[PDB]
Amino acid sequence: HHHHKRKGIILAGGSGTRLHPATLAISKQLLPVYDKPMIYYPLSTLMLAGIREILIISTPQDTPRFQQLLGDGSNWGLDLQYAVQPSPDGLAQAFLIGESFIGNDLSALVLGDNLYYGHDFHELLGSASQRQTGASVFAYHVLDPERYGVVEFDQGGKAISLEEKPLEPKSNYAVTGLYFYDQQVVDIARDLKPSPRGELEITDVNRAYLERGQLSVEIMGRGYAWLDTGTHDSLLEAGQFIATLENRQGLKVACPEEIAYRQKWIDAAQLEKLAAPLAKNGYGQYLKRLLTETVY
Amino acid sequence: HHHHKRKGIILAGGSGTRLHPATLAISKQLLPVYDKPMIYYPLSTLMLAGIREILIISTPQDTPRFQQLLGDGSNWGLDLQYAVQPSPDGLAQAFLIGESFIGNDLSALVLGDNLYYGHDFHELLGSASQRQTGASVFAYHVLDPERYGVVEFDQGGKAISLEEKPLEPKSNYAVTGLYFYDQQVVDIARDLKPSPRGELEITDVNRAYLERGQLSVEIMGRGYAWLDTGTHDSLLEAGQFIATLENRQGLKVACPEEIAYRQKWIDAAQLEKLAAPLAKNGYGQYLKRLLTETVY
Amino acid sequence: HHHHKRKGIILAGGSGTRLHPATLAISKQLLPVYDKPMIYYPLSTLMLAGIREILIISTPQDTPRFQQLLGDGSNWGLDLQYAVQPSPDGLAQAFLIGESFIGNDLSALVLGDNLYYGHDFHELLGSASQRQTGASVFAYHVLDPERYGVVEFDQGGKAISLEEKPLEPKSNYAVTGLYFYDQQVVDIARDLKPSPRGELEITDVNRAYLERGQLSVEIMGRGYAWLDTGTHDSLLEAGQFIATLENRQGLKVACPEEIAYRQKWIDAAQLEKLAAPLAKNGYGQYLKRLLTETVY
Amino acid sequence: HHHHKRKGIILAGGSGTRLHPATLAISKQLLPVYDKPMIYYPLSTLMLAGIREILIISTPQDTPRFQQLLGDGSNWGLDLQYAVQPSPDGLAQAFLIGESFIGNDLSALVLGDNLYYGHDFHELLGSASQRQTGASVFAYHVLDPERYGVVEFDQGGKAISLEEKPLEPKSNYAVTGLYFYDQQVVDIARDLKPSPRGELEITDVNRAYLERGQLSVEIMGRGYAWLDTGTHDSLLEAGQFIATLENRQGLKVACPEEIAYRQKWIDAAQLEKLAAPLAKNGYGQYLKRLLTETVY
Ligand SMILES: CN(c1c(N)n(Cc2ccccc2Br)c(=O)[nH]c1=O)S(=O)(=O)c1ccccc1
Ligand SMILES: CN(c1c(N)n(Cc2ccccc2Br)c(=O)[nH]c1=O)S(=O)(=O)c1ccccc1
Ligand SMILES: CN(c1c(N)n(Cc2ccccc2Br)c(=O)[nH]c1=O)S(=O)(=O)c1ccccc1
Ligand SMILES: CN(c1c(N)n(Cc2ccccc2Br)c(=O)[nH]c1=O)S(=O)(=O)c1ccccc1
Ligand SMILES: [Cl-]
Ligand SMILES: [Cl-]
Ligand SMILES: [Cl-]
Ligand SMILES: [Cl-]
C-alpha cells in the first residue's frame, strides 16, 4: 500500500448529452464493451506500455464508481489515484488536474473510451515510452477525419501541421487517443488559452511540440484496430469486434489481471485469489485457466 | 368491517455476479440496449398494457440512479415509486416488497431485463390486462427451455404442468418474464417456502394459480421477438436487433415519450419540452419529428 | 368467342453491378441470408399467401442454379417454372415475361431480395390474396423513403398519390416489394413506356390501379420487419437479424419445407425423406424435429 | 500473356453438405465476405507473400465460375491457372493435382476459406517465404482446437507432435490454413496413404517435415485475426469483422487490385482502367481514390 519513470492518466470524463439517454444514468467509460467495463481497455493499454502509477480522472458524480470498480490498484500491482474534472473544458485540462500527480516525471494520457487492438502492440508503445524527450503521438487512417485532430504530412512523410476538427481535412490521418509526453507538458498546458469552442485543446499541446520539432507522429498501421466508441452504432461494432476475437481464440483482450500477471506485477498466488470471487462465471474461469496454460 | 385498474411492478435488482465484471460499477438494467437504457424496454411494455402506476424495485445501491433516469414519472404521464431489494431472494419477493404499493389492486410484474417486439403486441397485452381474475402468462418457443419455467400442454393445447429449469423439458415453451395477477398474488407469495436454491420462485406462484384452474397461458407467437439478455453474447445481439429495426424504419422501439404521447398521457406541448434538452442528439430530434408526422 | 386462384412470380434477376464484386460470380438472390439462400425468403412469402404455382425469373446465366436449388417444386408441394430476363428492363417487365404463365389468372409479384418477418403475417397476406379485383400493395415506414415508391395519404388515411424515388418524399411510407394483381396487370404492363431511367416501372403500374380507384394500400405495421438487402451493410444486418431470431427460438424463418408441411402440401412421410440428405447438418435435424413436436 | 521462386495454390474445393442449403447452389469460396468474394482474401494473402503464379483448385462444377471471376490474372499482374479436385479426398491432394504446376519450384498452399488480418502481415509471410528449405506453418490459439491440426510444444517452446482432429487436444494451438513448402512436398504427398477418414491429410505432410526436423512452426499471435468460416454463425462474424475495419478506416482488407498496385505489379494507368467498370459503386470509387492518396 502507498499513501499520497512514467505516469499514466486516463481521462474518463463527461461526453455531454450526445449518447443520452443511454448515458444519462452513468458515464460512458463504466459501460461494458462486451464482457468488461470500457475503462479496462485504456487501463490495459497503459499497463501494456509498462505504466503502473496511474491517475483516473472522471466527473464528480462518477469518481466513487470508478474508485469502487478499480480500488487503489494494489490487487493488480498498480498504484491508482483519482481526481475530478468538474466541467468538460478540454482534454488538456488533464495536465492541470494532474499537475501534482505528474510532479517532475514523464507522462502518458489515454482517453477512457479508446480501444486499441493488434499485434506487437507492446513494442509499439514501449518505443514511444522509451523516447525520454519530446512527445509521441499516433496517426491512423480513418474515413471521417473531420471528427478528430488531423495530421498533414509532406511528400517525404514528415508531419507539418495539426488541425482540430477541420472543415476540410488535409489528409485522412487522425490522432488517436493515446499520448506520451516528457516534463514539458504541464507547463505548456498552463499556458494554453481556450479555443473558439471554449476548450483547452490537446491539439494545441501537440502543435507546441510540433512547432519545436519535438513531436514524434508514428503511423499506427491499418493492421491495428483503433475502435470507434463515439456513437451507439460504433459501441455496438466494438462489442461485436471484441466478442469475435475472444470467441475465436479462447483468449481475452484487455484483461487487466492477465496483463498484470504477464508483466509479473502479481504472482500465481495473487492471480488465483482474483479468480476466486468470479469462479462461477467465464471471467473467473479464464483467470484460473491462465495459471496452468502456456500462452505464447 | 364493511367494504364498498392494474398497477405494475418492474424488478430490476441484483443479477448477482453473473455478468461481472461488466456489471460491477452499475446494475444490468441500466446498461444500454442499443440507444436506450435496458429498463426503458420493460417500462414501455407496462405502458403498452395501459398501466400508469408503477413500482421500480432495485438494489439499495442503484435506486438513486433509477430515480435520476426516471424521476417520478410525471414527465411521461405516469407515477413511479421506488422500493429496494437488499438481498436477491427471488422474483416472487416483488409481491412482499410491493405489498403496500399493490394494495387491493390487480398487478403486473415485469422483469427489468426482458425485451419484447412485435405486431399487435398492444392487443396481446390488452387481452391479458382485461382478464380480471386469475393470472395470465405468456409461453414462447425457445431453443433452451431448460433455462426457464416450462409449460407442458396436453393434445388439446391446454396447460397442465409447469416446471422451473427442468433438465428434460416437456416442451420448448418457456414462460416469458411478464406476469399479470389478480388480488390473490400477495397472499400466494407470503405462503411460499424458499426453493432449495434459496429463492422465492415465480413459477411456484404460477403453479398455485394453475392448481386452482385460474392460469391462462397464451402463446406469444414465433412472429414476436422475446430477446435474450442473460449473457454478454445475447445482450450484444439484443442491441444489434434493435439497431437494425430502428435504422430500417426511422422509428424507435420502446421510446417511452412516444408511447405516452400516443396513449394521450401527454400532449404535443409537453412532448415538445421533453425534446428540448436532447435537441442536439438523434433521440431529441426523433421526439420533435413525432409532433408533425402521422405514424400509423 | 364464348367463355364459361393466384399464381406467383419471383423476380430474381440482374442487380446490375450494384454489389460487384461480391455478386460477380453469382447473382444476389442466391447469396445466403444467414443459413439459407436469399430466394427462400420471398418464396416462403408466396407460400404463406397460399400460392403454389410460381414462376421464377432470373438471368440466362443463373437460371440453371435456381433450377438446381429449387427443382420443379414437387418436393415441396409446389410447381415451379422458370423464365429468363436477358436485360434488366424494370420490374413491370415480369408481366410480359410471365404473360403466358399468368394466363387468365390473378397474380402476385415478389422481389427475390425482399425479406419479411412478423406476427399474423399469414393473415395480412390472406386479406390481400382474397381481394379478387384491383391491386394490393403494402406501405411500410422507412428511414429513407427517397429510395422507394412512396405513398402519400390524406388526413383520412386514404392513398392519394404514388411517386417513385422522390427527392422530397411526401411521407416515410415506402411500398414494399410484394404486389397482388387482378387480371388487368398484363394489359397495364404492355402499355407502359420506359421511364427516363430506361426501365418499365412497377410504380407506373400501381398508379394505373390508383387512378381507376382499384388500389388498396395496407399498412404493414412497425411490428413487422421488412429487411433491407440493398447494400453490403444491410445484407449483413439481415443475416444477423435472422440468426438472432432462429438461435433464440429454435425455429426457422422461411424454411420452405416446414411451410409446405404446415400448409399440408406435403405429409410427414414426404418431409422425412427431405430431411435425410441434410441429416448430418442442423437444417436436416430441424426438419426431423418438426415431425414430433407440436409448434403453435 | 502466358501460355501453359515460389508458386501458390488456393484449394477452394467442396465443403460437402455442412452449410447446405446455403451452399447448395454455389461453393462457399465464391460467396461474399462483406463486400467481396471469399477467395479474394486467400488470394490477397498469397499476393502479400509476394506470390504471383497461382493455381486455383475447385470442384468441377465451379471452376468455370472461378475462371470467370478472376480470369488469367493478367489485369492484376498475376499468372493464374486452374485445376479440379473431383472428390474431397483431403487437402494434401492439392500437391498431386498441382504436381505439374509446381514443377521443381517452391510452393505455398492457402485454404480458399481462410481469412487473415493484422499488422506486419507482409513481414510474417516474407519470413516464411524466404526460408528456402523445409516447411513453414503457423500455430494460433483457438477455443476449439479439436476441429483442427493441433500442435504440442515442449517446455522450451519446440513443436514435438501434430495431431489431426484429436479427441483430447494436447494444447489450444491449431495449424492455420496457410502452408509454405520446399521441393519435397510433392514427393511426400505421393507417398501418403488415406487416413481412417478416407483422406490425404495435410497434417501427415507436415508430420513428415516434423519427423525430419524440417518443420518451422511459428506462433501467429493473438494480435492477429484468423477468422473462422466453418459455420453460418462464423461467416456472419467474419463479414461483421471486415465491415467494422473497412468502415472505420476508409481502407479495404484484401483488395487484390490495391495489393497488386502496392507491389508495383500494375501501374497507375492499369489501376485506373480497373476502376472504370465499377466507377458507380464504392469499390470502383475506392480504387480511383487510391491513385491520388498516399496511404502509409
Ligand atoms: C490482444 N492484446 C493482448 C496481448 N498482446 N497480451 C499479451 C501481453 C501481455 C502482457 C505484456 C505483453 C504482452 Br504482448 C495480453 O496479455 N492481453 C491482450 O489483450 S493487445 O496487446 O493488442 C492489447 C493489450 C491491452 C489493451 C488492448 C490491446
Ligand atoms: C414496436 N412497438 C411499438 C409500438 N407498437 N408503438 C405503437 C403504439 C404505441 C402506443 C399504443 C399502441 C401502439 Br400500437 C410505439 O409507439 N412504440 C413501440 O415501440 S411494440 O408494440 O412491439 C413495443 C412496445 C413497447 C415495448 C416494446 C415493444
Ligand atoms: C416467422 N414466420 C413463419 C411462420 N409464421 N410460420 C408459421 C406458419 C406456417 C404456415 C402457415 C401459417 C403459419 Br402462421 C412458419 O412455418 N415459418 C415462418 O417463417 S412469418 O409468418 O413471419 C414468414 C413466413 C414466410 C417468410 C417469411 C416470414
Ligand atoms: C489489412 N492488410 C492489408 C495491407 N497491410 N495492405 C498493405 C500492403 C499492401 C501491399 C504490400 C504490403 C502491404 Br503492408 C494492403 O494493401 N491491403 C491489406 O488488406 S493485411 O496485410 O493484414 C492483409 C492483406 C491481404 C489479405 C489479408 C490481410
Ligand atoms: Cl499494418
Ligand atoms: Cl406468430
Ligand atoms: Cl404493428
Ligand atoms: Cl500478437
PDB file of C-alpha atoms in Angstrom, chain A residues 121-256:
ATOM      1  CA  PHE A 121       1.232  -3.536 -29.585  1.00  0.00           C
ATOM      2  CA  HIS A 122       3.544  -3.992 -26.530  1.00  0.00           C
ATOM      3  CA  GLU A 123       6.521  -2.966 -28.757  1.00  0.00           C
ATOM      4  CA  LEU A 124       4.779  -0.065 -30.488  1.00  0.00           C
ATOM      5  CA  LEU A 125       4.108   1.562 -27.036  1.00  0.00           C
ATOM      6  CA  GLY A 126       7.468   0.594 -25.451  1.00  0.00           C
ATOM      7  CA  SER A 127       9.116   2.506 -28.319  1.00  0.00           C
ATOM      8  CA  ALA A 128       7.122   5.701 -27.554  1.00  0.00           C
ATOM      9  CA  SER A 129       7.569   5.078 -23.761  1.00  0.00           C
ATOM     10  CA  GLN A 130      11.399   4.935 -24.104  1.00  0.00           C
ATOM     11  CA  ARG A 131      11.730   8.244 -26.048  1.00  0.00           C
ATOM     12  CA  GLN A 132      12.588  10.379 -22.914  1.00  0.00           C
ATOM     13  CA  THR A 133      12.294  13.823 -24.601  1.00  0.00           C
ATOM     14  CA  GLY A 134       9.501  15.355 -26.640  1.00  0.00           C
ATOM     15  CA  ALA A 135       6.022  13.938 -27.231  1.00  0.00           C
ATOM     16  CA  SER A 136       4.942  10.832 -29.157  1.00  0.00           C
ATOM     17  CA  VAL A 137       1.509  10.508 -30.760  1.00  0.00           C
ATOM     18  CA  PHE A 138      -0.076   8.013 -33.245  1.00  0.00           C
ATOM     19  CA  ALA A 139      -1.776   8.781 -36.607  1.00  0.00           C
ATOM     20  CA  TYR A 140      -4.356   6.303 -38.019  1.00  0.00           C
ATOM     21  CA  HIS A 141      -6.178   6.361 -41.308  1.00  0.00           C
ATOM     22  CA  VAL A 142      -9.948   6.877 -40.829  1.00  0.00           C
ATOM     23  CA  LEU A 143     -12.927   7.585 -43.057  1.00  0.00           C
ATOM     24  CA  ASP A 144     -14.108  10.672 -41.153  1.00  0.00           C
ATOM     25  CA  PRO A 145     -11.042  12.687 -40.160  1.00  0.00           C
ATOM     26  CA  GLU A 146     -13.186  15.928 -39.556  1.00  0.00           C
ATOM     27  CA  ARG A 147     -14.124  14.445 -36.130  1.00  0.00           C
ATOM     28  CA  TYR A 148     -10.512  14.377 -34.944  1.00  0.00           C
ATOM     29  CA  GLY A 149      -7.136  16.102 -34.737  1.00  0.00           C
ATOM     30  CA  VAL A 150      -5.823  15.704 -38.266  1.00  0.00           C
ATOM     31  CA  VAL A 151      -2.132  15.298 -39.304  1.00  0.00           C
ATOM     32  CA  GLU A 152      -0.829  16.716 -42.610  1.00  0.00           C
ATOM     33  CA  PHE A 153       2.366  15.194 -43.983  1.00  0.00           C
ATOM     34  CA  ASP A 154       4.828  16.488 -46.684  1.00  0.00           C
ATOM     35  CA  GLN A 155       5.977  14.271 -49.605  1.00  0.00           C
ATOM     36  CA  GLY A 156       8.811  12.778 -47.500  1.00  0.00           C
ATOM     37  CA  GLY A 157       6.268  11.658 -44.891  1.00  0.00           C
ATOM     38  CA  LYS A 158       7.019  14.301 -42.218  1.00  0.00           C
ATOM     39  CA  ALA A 159       4.258  15.820 -40.061  1.00  0.00           C
ATOM     40  CA  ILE A 160       3.918  19.562 -40.877  1.00  0.00           C
ATOM     41  CA  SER A 161       0.575  20.616 -39.386  1.00  0.00           C
ATOM     42  CA  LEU A 162      -2.124  19.536 -36.888  1.00  0.00           C
ATOM     43  CA  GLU A 163      -5.698  20.804 -37.020  1.00  0.00           C
ATOM     44  CA  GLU A 164      -8.540  20.051 -34.609  1.00  0.00           C
ATOM     45  CA  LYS A 165     -11.828  19.198 -36.346  1.00  0.00           C
ATOM     46  CA  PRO A 166     -11.052  20.901 -39.684  1.00  0.00           C
ATOM     47  CA  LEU A 167     -13.942  21.605 -42.105  1.00  0.00           C
ATOM     48  CA  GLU A 168     -11.650  20.494 -44.955  1.00  0.00           C
ATOM     49  CA  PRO A 169      -9.198  17.935 -43.549  1.00  0.00           C
ATOM     50  CA  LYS A 170      -5.716  17.862 -45.080  1.00  0.00           C
ATOM     51  CA  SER A 171      -5.358  14.024 -45.010  1.00  0.00           C
ATOM     52  CA  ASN A 172      -7.365  11.042 -43.623  1.00  0.00           C
ATOM     53  CA  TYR A 173      -4.903  10.719 -40.795  1.00  0.00           C
ATOM     54  CA  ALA A 174      -6.283  11.245 -37.292  1.00  0.00           C
ATOM     55  CA  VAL A 175      -4.500  11.457 -33.979  1.00  0.00           C
ATOM     56  CA  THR A 176      -5.561   8.577 -31.765  1.00  0.00           C
ATOM     57  CA  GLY A 177      -6.432   8.989 -28.027  1.00  0.00           C
ATOM     58  CA  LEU A 178      -3.030   7.970 -26.709  1.00  0.00           C
ATOM     59  CA  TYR A 179      -0.282  10.488 -25.976  1.00  0.00           C
ATOM     60  CA  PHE A 180       3.233  10.246 -24.426  1.00  0.00           C
ATOM     61  CA  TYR A 181       4.860  13.443 -23.117  1.00  0.00           C
ATOM     62  CA  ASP A 182       8.063  14.495 -21.426  1.00  0.00           C
ATOM     63  CA  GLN A 183       8.385  17.005 -18.485  1.00  0.00           C
ATOM     64  CA  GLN A 184       7.232  19.986 -20.630  1.00  0.00           C
ATOM     65  CA  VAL A 185       3.519  19.178 -20.994  1.00  0.00           C
ATOM     66  CA  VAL A 186       2.288  20.542 -17.715  1.00  0.00           C
ATOM     67  CA  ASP A 187       3.922  23.968 -18.386  1.00  0.00           C
ATOM     68  CA  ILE A 188       2.576  24.003 -21.997  1.00  0.00           C
ATOM     69  CA  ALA A 189      -0.924  23.169 -20.647  1.00  0.00           C
ATOM     70  CA  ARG A 190      -0.790  26.012 -18.099  1.00  0.00           C
ATOM     71  CA  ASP A 191      -0.061  28.491 -20.914  1.00  0.00           C
ATOM     72  CA  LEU A 192      -2.999  27.390 -23.060  1.00  0.00           C
ATOM     73  CA  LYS A 193      -5.948  29.652 -23.791  1.00  0.00           C
ATOM     74  CA  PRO A 194      -9.443  28.295 -24.575  1.00  0.00           C
ATOM     75  CA  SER A 195     -10.233  27.728 -28.277  1.00  0.00           C
ATOM     76  CA  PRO A 196     -13.274  29.235 -30.140  1.00  0.00           C
ATOM     77  CA  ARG A 197     -15.172  26.160 -28.733  1.00  0.00           C
ATOM     78  CA  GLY A 198     -14.347  27.070 -25.078  1.00  0.00           C
ATOM     79  CA  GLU A 199     -11.839  24.203 -24.557  1.00  0.00           C
ATOM     80  CA  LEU A 200      -8.219  23.576 -23.572  1.00  0.00           C
ATOM     81  CA  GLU A 201      -7.258  21.602 -26.705  1.00  0.00           C
ATOM     82  CA  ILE A 202      -4.870  18.654 -26.588  1.00  0.00           C
ATOM     83  CA  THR A 203      -4.176  19.519 -30.256  1.00  0.00           C
ATOM     84  CA  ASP A 204      -2.692  22.833 -29.103  1.00  0.00           C
ATOM     85  CA  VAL A 205      -0.423  20.895 -26.679  1.00  0.00           C
ATOM     86  CA  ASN A 206       0.736  18.717 -29.553  1.00  0.00           C
ATOM     87  CA  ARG A 207       1.180  21.666 -32.016  1.00  0.00           C
ATOM     88  CA  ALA A 208       3.503  23.253 -29.416  1.00  0.00           C
ATOM     89  CA  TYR A 209       5.697  20.165 -29.639  1.00  0.00           C
ATOM     90  CA  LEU A 210       5.371  20.195 -33.464  1.00  0.00           C
ATOM     91  CA  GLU A 211       6.412  23.886 -33.670  1.00  0.00           C
ATOM     92  CA  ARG A 212       9.557  22.956 -31.567  1.00  0.00           C
ATOM     93  CA  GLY A 213      10.322  19.914 -33.819  1.00  0.00           C
ATOM     94  CA  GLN A 214       9.754  17.714 -30.757  1.00  0.00           C
ATOM     95  CA  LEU A 215       6.597  15.788 -31.902  1.00  0.00           C
ATOM     96  CA  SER A 216       7.065  12.202 -32.988  1.00  0.00           C
ATOM     97  CA  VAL A 217       3.991  11.189 -35.108  1.00  0.00           C
ATOM     98  CA  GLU A 218       4.217   7.426 -35.690  1.00  0.00           C
ATOM     99  CA  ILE A 219       1.838   5.750 -38.150  1.00  0.00           C
ATOM    100  CA  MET A 220      -0.477   3.209 -36.488  1.00  0.00           C
ATOM    101  CA  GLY A 221      -0.950   0.817 -39.385  1.00  0.00           C
ATOM    102  CA  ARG A 222      -4.162  -0.485 -40.988  1.00  0.00           C
ATOM    103  CA  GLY A 223      -3.379  -3.849 -39.368  1.00  0.00           C
ATOM    104  CA  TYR A 224      -4.210  -2.302 -35.995  1.00  0.00           C
ATOM    105  CA  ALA A 225      -7.774  -1.712 -34.860  1.00  0.00           C
ATOM    106  CA  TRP A 226      -8.460   1.677 -33.257  1.00  0.00           C
ATOM    107  CA  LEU A 227     -12.147   1.173 -32.424  1.00  0.00           C
ATOM    108  CA  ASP A 228     -14.715   3.937 -32.563  1.00  0.00           C
ATOM    109  CA  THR A 229     -16.783   4.485 -29.372  1.00  0.00           C
ATOM    110  CA  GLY A 230     -18.440   7.820 -30.333  1.00  0.00           C
ATOM    111  CA  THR A 231     -21.914   6.623 -31.462  1.00  0.00           C
ATOM    112  CA  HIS A 232     -24.453   3.993 -30.384  1.00  0.00           C
ATOM    113  CA  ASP A 233     -23.664   2.223 -33.675  1.00  0.00           C
ATOM    114  CA  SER A 234     -19.940   2.359 -33.092  1.00  0.00           C
ATOM    115  CA  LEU A 235     -20.242   0.990 -29.467  1.00  0.00           C
ATOM    116  CA  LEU A 236     -22.155  -1.950 -30.866  1.00  0.00           C
ATOM    117  CA  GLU A 237     -19.494  -2.741 -33.552  1.00  0.00           C
ATOM    118  CA  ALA A 238     -16.821  -2.571 -30.863  1.00  0.00           C
ATOM    119  CA  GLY A 239     -18.520  -5.210 -28.664  1.00  0.00           C
ATOM    120  CA  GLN A 240     -19.107  -7.317 -31.771  1.00  0.00           C
ATOM    121  CA  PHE A 241     -15.376  -6.902 -32.614  1.00  0.00           C
ATOM    122  CA  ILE A 242     -14.123  -7.867 -29.192  1.00  0.00           C
ATOM    123  CA  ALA A 243     -16.575 -10.810 -28.939  1.00  0.00           C
ATOM    124  CA  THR A 244     -15.484 -12.271 -32.280  1.00  0.00           C
ATOM    125  CA  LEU A 245     -11.803 -12.137 -31.187  1.00  0.00           C
ATOM    126  CA  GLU A 246     -12.460 -13.633 -27.758  1.00  0.00           C
ATOM    127  CA  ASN A 247     -14.802 -16.384 -29.002  1.00  0.00           C
ATOM    128  CA  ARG A 248     -12.497 -17.470 -31.798  1.00  0.00           C
ATOM    129  CA  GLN A 249      -9.379 -17.515 -29.628  1.00  0.00           C
ATOM    130  CA  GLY A 250     -10.485 -18.521 -26.133  1.00  0.00           C
ATOM    131  CA  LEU A 251      -8.231 -15.550 -25.173  1.00  0.00           C
ATOM    132  CA  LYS A 252      -9.382 -12.126 -23.781  1.00  0.00           C
ATOM    133  CA  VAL A 253      -8.465  -8.665 -24.999  1.00  0.00           C
ATOM    134  CA  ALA A 254      -7.555  -6.121 -22.235  1.00  0.00           C
ATOM    135  CA  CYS A 255      -7.969  -8.379 -19.212  1.00  0.00           C
ATOM    136  CA  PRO A 256      -6.037  -6.319 -16.613  1.00  0.00           C
TER     137      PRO A 256
END
